[PDB]
């Protein structure tokens, strides 16, 4: 979400060995925003889908 | 009040699902300022009324 220095705490671009869940579909909750949502509600690696 | 990075901790603009108390009237204590007051004394969502 809107947090101070959020790029440091991401895996942010890449391999991140447990980030080989590219074959998983993102689930969007029925009124989910992009910011304070599914990037924390799916998992740690939901930031490679753009969230 | 005068705090460091206060815009991050607001819901600040919008839906904020529990912020559908727009039908509530703001109560102003008998010598209440706007800054260190009713935005913390009414509730979390008293910042959509401008406080």
């Amino acid at each position: 979400e809107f947090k101070h220095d959020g790029l440091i705490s991401k895996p942010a671009s890449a391999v991140a060995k447990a980030a080989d869940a590219l074959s998983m579909i993102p689930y969007i909750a029925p009124y989910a925003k992009a910011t304070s949502m599914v990037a924390d509600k799916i998992g740690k690696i939901a930031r490679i889908f753009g969230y | 009040e005068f705090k460091h990075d206060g815009l991050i901790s607001k819901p600040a603009s919008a839906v904020a699902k529990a912020a559908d108390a727009l039908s509530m009237i703001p109560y102003i204590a008998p010598y209440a300022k706007a800054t260190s007051m009713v935005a913390d004394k009414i509730g979390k969502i008293a910042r959509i009324f401008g406080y």
Binding site: - | L22, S23, I25, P26, F49, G50
Partner: protein, 52 residues
């Protein structure tokens, strides 16, 4: 009193019409549009007052 709903919820006189003796069943007395902008104008050739 700077809430929008505190200003807008005030019941304010808007207009006035009449109901004649010659009115019969199914006679229209007034028709009005359901919207916020209920104003009334007073023209007097240079000026045009808008009472809202």
């Amino acid at each position: 009193e700077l809430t929008i709903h505190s200003i807008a919820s005030r019941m304010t006189f808007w207009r006035q019409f009449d109901w004649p003796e010659s009115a019969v069943t199914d006679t229209l007395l007034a028709s009005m549009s359901v919207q916020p902008f209920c104003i009334d104008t007073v023209t007097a050739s240079p000026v045009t007052e808008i009472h809202s």
